[PDB]
Design a protein around this nucleic acid. Structure first.
Ligand SMILES: [Zn+2]
Ligand SMILES: [Zn+2]
Length: 373
RNA sequence: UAAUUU
């Protein structure tokens, strides 16, 4: 049993080190809770361990490297078989550890590794982004710890004395910022079937209401809009969950959450989102507030379909337009751009669905009628 | 809280 395999850490140690506030000073130690399991999950781990290591000065003593050494010796002492390793790490790997683990995984196909990270270390630095991409390309599955992973870590590796895990304030908001940033820096691409299903602009027949949203940023330079390749990606709405957002968080609000997190300077920026549903009234109100907030940012909203929220959505779109947002229905060129840019297309060109242009024209006429009232 | 990497 795990509590017999690990010496559980102090609750104060866990809460202070795994707090997922993305920008957090003072934490000079990395913590790593790991389980080693067989191909079959659904058991106690073969073994479990807690490693720690000071961030500075010697990366050779970071817990990732302590794990590699311990796991080498451990595998010597147990009958060989394929292993599934899981880490909960308080900080994501530094460039040296990311490269060492990537080398280890690439040279050993019998081992697969999943890394849940509480916070992203130096996510804004190109070297760290590149090293995490190298780790991903070696096979490591990298994810941000959410409530379930924090709770699992609490249950397995913390001396909670039977008390349940108590989430700190803003755990879900921090989670969404970090997950979007991880998607950006790993350059996650949308699944092609997911894109085609959600961005088809014929009248919607599915019972699902979900919103997918692709985003990019441009900077004004010498009177020309130039690309800002850093902040490009996609996201979706957060369905309601009492451990996350109890009333949900719509895709447009998650998008708005991202913009201050980018820490844009005073230059002129044009932020564009391609959203499968036009925003509901609440989303449009919040976007209008943001526009009134950040004059150095111009919003361009392209929508695949018009979402009738059974309420004030027309007034919402009119308010958004009145406040300076560019709102347009997506036409062929916008769909093709999103296919080429955000989708895991694997060389395949954009294949438009039936009636794309006709549905675009109908929806464009509807949008024009809404905005002219 | 943009957070000491030899
Ligand atoms: Zn390291
Ligand atoms: Zn909405």
């Amino acid at each position: 049993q795990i509590r017999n395999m690990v010496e559980p850490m102090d609750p104060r140690t866990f809460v202070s080190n795994f707090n997922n506030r993305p920008i957090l000073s003072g934490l000079d130690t990395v913590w790593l809770c790991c389980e080693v399991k067989t191909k079959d999950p659904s058991g106690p781990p073969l073994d479990a361990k807690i490693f720690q290591g000071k961030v500075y000065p010697k990366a050779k003593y970071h817990p990732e490297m302590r794990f590699l050494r311990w796991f080498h010796k451990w595998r010597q002492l147990h009958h060989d078989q394929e292993y599934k390793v899981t880490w909960y790490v308080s900080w994501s790997p530094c460039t040296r550890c990311a490269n060492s683990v990537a080398t280890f995984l690439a040279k050993d196909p019998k081992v697969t590794l999943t890394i849940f990270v509480a916070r992203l270390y130096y996510f804004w630095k190109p070297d760290y982004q590149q090293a995490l991409r190298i780790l991903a390309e070696a096979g490591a599955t990298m994810k941000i710890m959410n409530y379930n992973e924090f709770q699992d870590c609490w249950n397995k590796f913390v001396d909670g004395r039977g008390k349940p895990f108590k989430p700190w304030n803003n755990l879900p908001k921090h989670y969404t910022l970090l997950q979007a940033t991880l998607g950006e820096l790993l350059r996650h691409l949308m699944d092609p079937g997911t894109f085609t299903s959600n961005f088809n602009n014929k009248p919607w027949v599915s019972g699902q209401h979900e919103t997918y949203l692709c985003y990019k940023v441009e900077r004004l330079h010498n009177d020309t809009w130039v690309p800002l390749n850093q902040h490009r990606g996609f996201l979706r709405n957060q369905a309601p969950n009492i451990h996350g957002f109890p009333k949900g968080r719509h895709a447009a609000l998650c998008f708005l959450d991202l913009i201050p997190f980018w820490k844009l300077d005073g230059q002129q920026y044009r932020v564009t989102c391609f959203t499968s549903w036009s925003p509901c009234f609440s989303c449009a109100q919040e976007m209008a507030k943001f526009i009134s907030n950040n004059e150095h940012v111009s919003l361009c909203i392209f929508a695949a379909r018009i979402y009738d929220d059974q309420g004030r959505y027309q007034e919402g779109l009119r308010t958004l337009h009145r406040d300076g947002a560019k709102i347009a229905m997506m036409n062929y060129s916008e769909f093709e751009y999103c296919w080429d840019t955000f989708v895991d297309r694997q060389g395949r060109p954009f294949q438009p669905w039936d009636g794309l242009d006709e549905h675009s024209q109908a929806l464009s006429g509807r949008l024009r009628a809404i905005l002219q009232n």
